[PDB]
Amino acid sequence: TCPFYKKIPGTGFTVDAFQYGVVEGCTAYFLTHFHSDHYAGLSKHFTFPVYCSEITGNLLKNKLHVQEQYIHPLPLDTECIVNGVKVVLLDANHCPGAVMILFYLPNGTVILHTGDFRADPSMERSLLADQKVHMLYLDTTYCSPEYTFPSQQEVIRFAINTAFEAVTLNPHALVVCGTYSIGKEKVFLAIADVLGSKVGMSQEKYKTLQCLNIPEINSLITTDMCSSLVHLLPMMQINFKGLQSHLKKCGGKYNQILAFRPTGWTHSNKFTRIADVIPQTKGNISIYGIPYSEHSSYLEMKRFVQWLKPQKIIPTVNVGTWKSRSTMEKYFREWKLEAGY
Numbered sequence: 001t002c003p004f005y006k007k008i009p010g011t012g013f014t015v016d017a018f019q020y021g022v023v024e025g026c027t028a029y030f031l032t033h034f035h036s037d038h039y040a041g042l043s044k045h046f047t048f049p050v051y052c053s054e055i056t057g058n059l060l061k062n063k064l065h066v067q068e069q070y071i072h073p074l075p076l077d078t079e080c081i082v083n084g085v086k087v088v089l090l091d092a093n094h095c096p097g098a099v100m101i102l103f104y105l106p107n108g109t110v111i112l113h114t115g116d117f118r119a120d121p122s123m124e125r126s127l128l129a130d131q132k133v134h135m136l137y138l139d140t141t142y143c144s145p146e147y148t149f150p151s152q153q154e155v156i157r158f159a160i161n162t163a164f165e166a167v168t169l170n171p172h173a174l175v176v177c178g179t180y181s182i183g184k185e186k187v188f189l190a191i192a193d194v195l196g197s198k199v200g201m202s203q204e205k206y207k208t209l210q211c212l213n214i215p216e217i218n219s220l221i222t223t224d225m226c227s228s229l230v231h232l233l234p235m236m237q238i239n240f241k242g243l244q245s246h247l248k249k250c251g252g253k254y255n256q257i258l259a260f261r262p263t264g265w266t267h268s269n270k271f272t273r274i275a276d277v278i279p280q281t282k283g284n285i286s287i288y289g290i291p292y293s294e295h296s297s298y299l300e301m302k303r304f305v306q307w308l309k310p311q312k313i314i315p316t317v318n319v320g321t322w323k324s325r326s327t328m329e330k331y332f333r334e335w336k337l338e339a340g341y
C-alpha cells in the first residue's frame with residue numbers, strides 16, 4: 001500500500017508512487033525524475049496522467065513506451081494549474097530532468113517536495129524565496145554528520161588531471177567509466193573533452209543520452225567503440241575480471257585500462273582528502289572510486305533547511321528503521337533550536 005510520505009494532503013496527488021497499483025483517490029501522479037526506485041511500476045499500459053519535466057517525459061516515452069496522451073510535461077520555473085491546484089517545478093540539482101515540486105494548497109498551505117536533490121545556495125534565489133513553506137518532504141539520504149564529500153567541481157578536476165596524465169604518459173591506455181542509471185554524465189564528458197575524443201557506449205545507453213537535451217551531444221558521444229578512447233560500461237563490469245575481458249575485445253589497440261567508479265559516499269571520506277585518493281591496481285589495470293554525489297551532504301542539507309524554515313519536516317529516505325527515524329528527528333530539532341524558528 002502507498003506510504004503516507006508519498007501522498008500530498010488535500011489534493012488528489014501522489015509523488016513517485018507507481019508501484020502500488022491504482023492508488024485510492026489519486027487524480028494525477030507526479031514523477032520527480034527517471035530513477036528506477038522512483039518510476040517503479042510505469043510501463044506502456046499505464047493509463048492515468050503523469051506530470052513531470054520535459055526530459056523525464058522524453059524518457060518515459062522512449063525508454064518505457066508510455067503513451068504520449070498520458071504524459072504531461074511542464075516547464076520549469078513557471079506557475080501552472082493542475083486539477084485546480086497551482087504547482088511549480090524547480091531544478092533539483094540531481095540527474096538530468098530531476099525536479100522539486102512546490103504545491104499551493106487551496107486552504108493556503110504551501111508544500112515543497114524535494115524529490116532527490118543536492119541542496120545548493122542557488123536555490124535560495126529561485127521562486128522559493130518569495131513565500132513561506134509550511135511542510136517539507138525532504139531527501140534525507142545523507143542526513144548524518146559523517147557524510148562529507150567534496151564539491152562536484154573538485155572531483156571533476158581530479159578526474160580530468162588523472163586521465164590526462166595517464167594517457168599522455170601512455171597513448172595506448174584506454175579510459176573506462178562505469179554507469180547504471182542517468183546522472184553524473186559530467187564525469188565521462190569532462191574526461192573525453194580533455195582527451196579530444198567522443199565517448200563510446202552501447203546502443204541502449206546512447207538512446208538514453210539522446211533523450212536528455214544536452215547541448216552539442218551529437219558532438220560528444222557515439223556507438224562506434226573503435227573510434228573512441230573513453231568507453232562506458234555497466235557499473236557491474238568495473239572490476240579486474242570485467243576490465244581484462246573488455247581489454248581483450250579491443251584487439252590489441254590498447255595495453256592498459258584506467259577506470260572510474262563514481263560512487264556516492266565511501267568511508268574513505270572520513271579520513272582522506274580528494275587530493276590523496278589512490279586506485280586499486282592489478283597488472284595493467286587501475287580502478288579509482290571517486291565521491292561524485294548527486295545528493296546533499298549533511299552540511300548542504302542543514303544550510304537549506306535552516307534557510308527555508310519549514311514548520312514540519314517529513315523524511316522520504318532512511319524511513320524504514322526506528323533508529324534512523326530517531327536520529328533524523330534529533331538533527332531536525334538541533335537545526336531548529338540553533339536557528340531560532
Ligand code: NI
Pocket residue numbers: 033035094116
Ligand atoms: Ni535518484
